[PDB]
Amino acid sequence: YNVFPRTLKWSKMNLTYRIVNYTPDMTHSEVEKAFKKAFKVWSDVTPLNFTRLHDGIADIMISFGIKEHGDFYPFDGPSGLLAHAFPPGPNYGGDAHFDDDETWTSSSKGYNLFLVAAHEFGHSLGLDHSKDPGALMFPIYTYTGHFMLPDDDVQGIQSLYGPGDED
Ligand SMILES: O=C(NCc1cccc(OCCSc2nc[nH]n2)c1)c1nc2ccccc2c(=O)[nH]1
Ligand SMILES: [Ca+2]
Ligand SMILES: [Ca+2]
Ligand SMILES: [Ca+2]
Ligand SMILES: [Zn+2]
Ligand SMILES: [Zn+2]
């Protein structure tokens, strides 16, 4: 027999993602680089592996949409809600949605896609919000300006998946 696990987490280390569509704001290459870097934040400190799929069904389906986009979490136009992600699980589980009424960038302007993606993927992997104002998983976006994952987030993700290779 099997009972359901204690926390919401992926039960496998090999995860897939798919970039379903793309924002007008950035080149395809910029978007791809941003997401690749965002996943690397988490794989660098766990045993998790992330592989991109070009089509079909991936664990983490990534898309850009506006207003009603196919779930119970409609977007709201410019500002306000910017993105959301589902905790680990089937179908919707793990998926990450970005509000395409926001301005997404590879800079300090608008919302930096890498930074928001890294936060959202934290949710996709089973982290909720932190109370540490310096954490990646703090609930309020601030662009501070070499990226290092804060210790609070390291401790959080490793509580779920272990450290993988520590060196
Ligand atoms: O801003 C930072 N972290 C918090 C954050 C990020 C993204 C979105 C956020 O909030 C989104 C709205 S809450 C929501 N809505 C739906 N899901 N979750 C909040 C940050 N961390 C860093 C950590 C290390 C180095 C630099 C930085 C840096 O430069 N910035
Ligand atoms: Ca919005
Ligand atoms: Ca999914
Ligand atoms: Ca946009
Ligand atoms: Zn959504
Ligand atoms: Zn969040």
**Do the Cβ atoms of 121 and 58 come closer than 8 Å?**
no
Paired tokens of 143: 């662009």
| Cα 158 to ligand 5 centroid, rounded to whole Å | 27
| Cα 65 to ligand 6 centroid, rounded to whole Å | 18
Who contacts 107 (Cβ-Cβ below 8 Å, separation ≥6)? none
Give the count of alpha carbons within 13 A of 134, CB side only: 7
| Cα 1 to ligand 6 centroid, rounded to whole Å | 35
Distance from C-alpha of 93 to C-alpha of 35, rounded to nearest angstrom: 18
Catalytically annotated residue among 30, 68, 120, 166? 120
Q: Which alpha helices (H) appear in the chain, and where do they start and end?
A: 28-43, 113-124, 151-161
C-alpha distances (whole Å) from 80 to each of 90, 94, 103, 106, 150 are 28, 22, 12, 20, 25
**Do the Cβ atoms of 83 and 56 come closer than 8 Å?**
no
In the chain, after which residues does the backbone break, taking C–N over 2.5 angstroms as a break? Answer: 145
- Domains of the chain, earliest start first: 1-167 (3.40.390.10)
Who contacts 59 (Cβ-Cβ below 8 Å, separation ≥6)? 10, 15, 16, 17, 93, 94
Resolution in A: 1.6
Among all bound ligands, the one having the nearest atom to the CA of 136 is: 1
Is 120 annotated as catalytic?
yes
Count CB atoms within 10 A of the CB of residue 15: 21
Judge whether 54 is annotated as a binding position: no
Phi, psi of 16 (to 5 degrees): -115, 150
Which residues lie across from 83 on neighbouring strands?
A: 98
Classify burial at 34, counting beta carbons within 10 Å of its beta carbon; exposed 0-12, middle 13-18, buried 19 or more: buried
Q: What lines the ligand 1 site, CB under 6 Å?
A: 82-84, 115-116, 119, 123, 136, 138-144, 147, 150
Paired tokens of 59: 């664990």
C-alpha distances (whole Å) from 17 to each of 58, 69, 71, 74, 107 are 5, 19, 19, 22, 24
Distance from C-alpha of 151 to C-alpha of 138, rounded to nearest angstrom: 12
Residue 97's closest CA among 80, 114, 112, 82? 82
